[PDB]
Amino acid sequence: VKQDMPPVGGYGPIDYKRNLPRRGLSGYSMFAVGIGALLFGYWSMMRWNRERRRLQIEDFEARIALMP
Amino acid sequence: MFMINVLTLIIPILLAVAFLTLVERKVLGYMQFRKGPNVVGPYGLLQPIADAIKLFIKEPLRPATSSISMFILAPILALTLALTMWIPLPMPYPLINMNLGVLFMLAMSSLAVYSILWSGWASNSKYALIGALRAVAQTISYEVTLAIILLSVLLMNGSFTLSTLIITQEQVWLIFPAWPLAMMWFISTLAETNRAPFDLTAGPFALFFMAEYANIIMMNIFTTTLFLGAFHNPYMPELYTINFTIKSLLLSITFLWIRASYPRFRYDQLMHLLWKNFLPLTLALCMWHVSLPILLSSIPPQT
């Protein structure tokens, strides 16, 4: 009998592919998302700014009527 | 009570820096396949206490310097900047309510540039002078850009008071009206704190090290304050303190995590990169943030 170490029954395949799935989407979608979220933030910032303008005018009314 | 406030603000910075050293070593360790330091005590806290006290024990190299008084004068300046420079940054109610503090932030960063230059002069012979001179140049290359971006991000906020900032970031975070401006700002904060991907390649290395990591925690605290923050309810501010500390922790981890996985830049590539890529784009974002609020009919209510 012989007791070397051959490949017992053959070994299966071994990959060597450059498998890069390319996660993400196209860049035009990235520009669309960026400009959309940016403009969303601009509109919300505009609304909050003019609300605080209203309250700032009310504080001006306080300092005007409080003075004499 | 005022010196009690002073002690409660400037005593825990040493604990903050040493525990930041263990935090960044453990974070780099789990970015690698490493544990450690965990053999020395429970999860390695008295191990930063121990190597800090060892480096205070360990005997200095005898000078071999020139102008011993100047060798005194540079790291004392770096560490006193790192001590004085957490004052107007609001954890909910800040230490000194100022009319203007962010120009003070940038000017104190310029004083840190002075300290780096004085250490590089007073250290040693010519090659250390050349290396520290290039380091001063790549630190001074960004107080143009970071101050310009600061000006652009608080042009939407009117005043320098920083409490109007902590008010007017209640609705949406300011990361949304300026994402590329903020991203270039964060790159410039990596440049101010001078870590990888921005290269470096003496004494006291403990004090140099201390000033650098307090500068890191300072810039990330000012990052969290400048761009975001949740709603502040008075007569319960511990909520804002907790949420502030959590987001500053997450951004400091992200900061070290950006350090963890990129090669250093070539020096001329760094200058080429900064000038010919950031500086026209920062100007363009400045002029568009000038021309925007006259078009949204919303100049900020500058009190």
UniProtKB/Swiss-Prot annotation, chain B:
It is an enzyme of class 7 (translocase). GO terms for molecular function: NADH dehydrogenase (ubiquinone) activity. Keywords: Electron transport, Membrane, Mitochondrion, Mitochondrion inner membrane, NAD, Respiratory chain, Translocase, Transmembrane, Transmembrane helix, Transport, Ubiquinone. It catalyses: a ubiquinone + NADH + 5 H(+)(in) = a ubiquinol + NAD(+) + 4 H(+)(out). The keyword Electron transport applies. InterPro entries: NADH_UbQ_OxRdtase_su1/FPO (IPR001694), NADH_UbQ_OxRdtase_su1_CS (IPR018086). Pfam families: NADHdh. One of its GO terms (biological process) is mitochondrial respiratory chain complex I assembly. It is a multi-pass membrane protein. It is found in: Mitochondrion inner membrane. Its EC number is 7.1.1.2. It comes from the Eukaryota. PROSITE patterns: COMPLEX1_ND1_1, COMPLEX1_ND1_2. The keyword Protein biosynthesis does not apply. GO terms for cellular component: mitochondrial inner membrane; respiratory chain complex I. The chain crosses the membrane at residues 2-22, 68-88, 100-120, 147-167, 172-192, 202-222, 238-258, 279-299. Core subunit of the mitochondrial membrane respiratory chain NADH dehydrogenase (Complex I) that is believed to belong to the minimal assembly required for catalysis. Complex I functions in the transfer of electrons from NADH to the respiratory chain. The immediate electron acceptor for the enzyme is believed to be ubiquinone. HAMAP family: NDH1_NuoH. Belongs to the complex I subunit 1 family. This is NADH-ubiquinone oxidoreductase chain 1. The gene is MT-ND1.
